[PDB]
């Protein structure tokens, strides 16, 4: 019991360090900077190909080939410039929660509600796409998949663990066990050296794939968090929660840096992503729309209402040309 | 203007036609979520029909393709994935009827039924409940009567009202009675017509679904 008391002493110590030796004053490091007024973005293309509610969005480094899966078990690979389709990959584990896209452009990741992270091959000979490996080893459900390279892959599985594999072996080469809840979201760094994961414990942790021990733990919410994304500087990450609060956490500061909320939103997040400069934050609420926050002033810059049902995932290009709000109304938009 | 991209548009149109026929194939099929208490009675009503986290049970009965999902062997936060099951036609909520005396357990199934019945994603979807184990409940009332786990009960300690009382006790848990129906059939090892009751309730919900899509409702 005294070991629990010493654990509470350590928690009080890491709260006293980020309380006394941290002097944020970030109503003053943002009143000097000018706002962005109000940004106006319109639906350039309505990618209309699914027949069910979708759950995933990730674009490649080409900024054209986005992947998107839905309830019907038909993840299709779109084309951002020409509205066309290039692949309609059939799959078995139809209750898909998430997808990803390899930075080389060769693979996609799938993953459903039945503990199977399927990775597919695209740039292959011998015809169509082909199920390369069947990554398993969890107990709960896959929630967010991401690629490091064509060799390695990290995920975020509902049985409290995050995992780093090797694809050609399929065994969990590194586990990540630090939570007491279901890790709902997962995001990577621009150098892909260290990632961050958000769970049901109202806490987002920063893991590193070198060793496997979580380096810092970031709390501050009141409920589950459903969207994590690193800032493009690689030194901050935005957490959306079910408390209508997409607060921005700072790694070097090591506390909650600032909080983003509004009065008449008592609603829930589903997806959060930055631009390529991070002045604006694409918070995808469940108010059948998504908002665009001026991410260094905690002010709203835009309202991208273009749907009829709640958005689920929201990807931004690697070169900052578009966002892709994908709603449960099956008609994922591309804004600009 | 579309030099070789005409063949790309033709490829997209071909696989779009494939997506359309696959969507029609999924539309004429009908899915049923299958809940249940922990090791209570769901092992019977996956065997009464023709027949990893989720495991499908794809069967058919009278020109109609059923897809059961006995999900309940997956231990996680149920609220953060149950939203994938909206738009399901029926939710078979299997309850052991004779588990009323164990360490309480009937109140655990009441809590799970109150969770799924008043759930915000399932406020329109009808729910079927299969009170199993009639072959044990007819003789664990004469000897170890129902007065243990119902203090507000009095009188009929026979089968002819006890299962009806537990049926009314479950049916009195919907707060929205004018929108969703709660069906009940007492399954048993003999007279394998439980799939007939599944077919009847799914037909009765397909009628309401087509009236809602047509505009009568």
């Amino acid at each position, epitope marked *: 019991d005294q070991l629990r008391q010493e654990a509470e002493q350590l928690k009080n110590q890491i709260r006293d360090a980020r309380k006394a030796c941290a002097d944020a004053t970030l109503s003053q490091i943002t009143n000097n900077i000018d706002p962005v007024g109000r940004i106006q973005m319109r639906t350039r293309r309505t990618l209309r190909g699914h027949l069910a509610k979708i759950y995933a969005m990730h674009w490649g480094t*080409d900024s*054209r*080939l986005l992947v998107s899966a839905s309830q019907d078990g038909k993840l299709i690979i779109w*084309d951002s410039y*020409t509205t*066309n389709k*290039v*692949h309609a990959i059939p799959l078995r584990s139809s209750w898909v929660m998430t997808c990803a896209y390899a930075p080389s*452009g060769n693979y996609v990741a799938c993953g459903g509600l039945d503990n199977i992270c399927s990775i597919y091959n695209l*740039k292959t*000979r*011998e*015809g*169509n796409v082909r199920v390369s490996r069947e990554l398993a080893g969890h107990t709960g459900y896959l929630s967010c998949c991401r690629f490091l390279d064509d060799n390695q892959i990290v995920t975020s599985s509902g049985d409290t663990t995050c995992a780093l594999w090797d694809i050609e072996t399929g065994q969990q080469t590194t586990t990540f066990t630090g939570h007491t809840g279901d890790v709902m979201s997962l995001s990577l760094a621009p150098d892909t050296r260290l990632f961050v994961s958000g769970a049901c414990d109202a806490s987002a942790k920063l893991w590193d794939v070198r060793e496997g021990m979580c380096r810092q733990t970031f709390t501050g919410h009141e409920s589950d968090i459903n969207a994590i994304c690193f800032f493009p500087n690689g030194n901050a990450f935005a957490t959306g929660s079910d408390d209508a609060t997409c607060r921005l956490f700072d790694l070097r500061a090591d506390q909650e840096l600032m909080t983003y909320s509004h009065d008449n939103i008592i609603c829930g997040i589903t997806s959060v992503s930055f631009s390529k400069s991070g002045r604006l934050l694409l918070a995808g609420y469940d108010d059948f729309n998504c908002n665009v926050w001026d991410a260094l002033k905690a002010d709203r810059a835009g309202v991208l209402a273009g749907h009829d049902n709640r958005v689920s995932c929201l990807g931004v290009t690697d070169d900052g040309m578009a966002v892709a709000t994908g709603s449960w109304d099956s008609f994922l938009k591309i804004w600009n | *203007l579309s*030099a*070789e*991209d*005409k*063949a*790309a548009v*033709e*490829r*997209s*149109k*071909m696989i779009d036609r494939n997506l359309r026929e696959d969507g029609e194939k999924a539309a004429r099929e009908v899915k049923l979520l299958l809940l249940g208490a922990g090791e209570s009675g769901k092992s019977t009503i996956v065997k009464q029909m023709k027949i990893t986290g989720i495991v499908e049970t794809h069967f058919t009965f009278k020109d109609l393709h059923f897809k059961m999902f006995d999900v309940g062997g997956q231990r996680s936060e149920r609220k953060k994935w149950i939203h994938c099951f909206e738009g399901v036609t029926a939710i078979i909520f299997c309850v052991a009827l004779s588990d009323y005396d164990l360490v309480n357990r009937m109140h655990e199934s009441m809590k799970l039924f109150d969770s799924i019945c008043n759930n915000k994603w399932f406020t329109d979807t009808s729910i079927i409940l299969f009170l199993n184990k009639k072959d044990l409940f007819e003789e664990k009332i004469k000897k170890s009567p129902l007065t243990i786990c119902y203090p507000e009960y009095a009188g009929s300690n026979t089968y002819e009202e006890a299962a009806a009382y537990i049926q009314c006790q479950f049916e009195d848990l919907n707060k929205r009675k004018d929108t969703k129906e709660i069906y009940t059939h007492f399954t048993c090892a003999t007279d394998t017509k439980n799939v007939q009751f599944v077919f009847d309730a799914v037909t009765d919900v397909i009628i309401k679904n087509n009236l809602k899509d047509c505009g009568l409702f």
Partner: single-chain antibody
Framework: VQLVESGGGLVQPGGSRKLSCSAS????????MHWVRQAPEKGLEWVAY????????YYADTVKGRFTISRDDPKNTLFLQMTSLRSEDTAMYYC??????????????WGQGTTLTVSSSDIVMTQATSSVPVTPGESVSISCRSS???????????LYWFLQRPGQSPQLLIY???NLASGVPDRFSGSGSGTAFTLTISRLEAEDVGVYYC?????????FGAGTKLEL
């Protein structure tokens, strides 16, 4: 991947002959298909095309009306029923696989070919140099001018390069001027602009000797250059 043509032979002028191309080891019906032909001492000439799903069919002008291309997708087989065959049709007939989507590599596999000996507006792809001698290890630059600009408003330039080693079927090297086809060594590189194109080989190695074809894929009919020959 295997493609096996058959149906070749000797035919009297005015007669008919059906060629078959049997595909195996790949998802045949997902691919568009072409026939490309090669007269005895001459270059490549495109004959006919069937898209995935058979919705789109194109013929070369010199063969339209006379040749019919068709496919039997359940049996994974392509046919070309030819009628009223003339002496000018004597050629090796190649079956060619293709697929058109963003980043795809069309024309990436050719059959072994069948010889059909017969008894007795278009974009011009000028290749002014018919042969070039090359000593091993050196580096070479071949040029290929086009009669029309191949740069399209989308930014892609639809120029393809093939290699036919002596006695073998042709093999794709570069698609859309500068992208290396799968399996092709990095000694090949492509460059160019509108109406002007360049193939460059660095440290040329053995067996690389053969005929190099330029090809336009801007509009139908597809047209080839006269071919550049290497020699030891």
């Amino acid at each position: 991947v295997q493609l096996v043509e058959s149906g070749g032979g000797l035919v009297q002028p005015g007669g008919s002959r059906k060629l078959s191309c049997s595909a195996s080891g790949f998802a045949f019906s997902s691919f568009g298909m072409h026939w490309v032909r090669q007269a005895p001492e001459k270059g490549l000439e495109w004959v006919a095309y069937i898209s995935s799903g058979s919705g789109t069919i194109y013929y070369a002008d010199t063969v339209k009306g006379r040749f019919t291309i068709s496919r039997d997708d359940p049996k994974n087989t392509l046919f070309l029923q030819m009628t009223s065959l003339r002496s000018e049709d004597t050629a090796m007939y190649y079956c060619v696989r293709s697929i058109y989507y963003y980043g795809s590599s069309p024309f990436d596999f050719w059959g072994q070919g069948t010889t059909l000996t017969v008894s007795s507006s278009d974009i011009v792809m000028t290749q002014a140099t018919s042969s070039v001698p090359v000593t091993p290890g050196e580096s070479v630059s071949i040029s290929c001018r086009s009669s029309k600009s191949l740069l399209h408003s989308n930014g892609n330039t639809y120029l393809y390069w093939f290699l036919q080693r002596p006695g073998q079927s042709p093999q794709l090297l570069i698609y859309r001027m500068s992208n290396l086809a799968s399996g092709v060594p990095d000694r090949f590189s492509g460059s160019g602009s509108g109406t002007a194109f360049t193939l460059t080989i660095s440290r040329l190695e053995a067996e690389d000797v053969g005929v190099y074809y330029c090809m336009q894929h801007l509009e139908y009919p597809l047209t080839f250059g006269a071919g550049t020959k290497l020699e030891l």
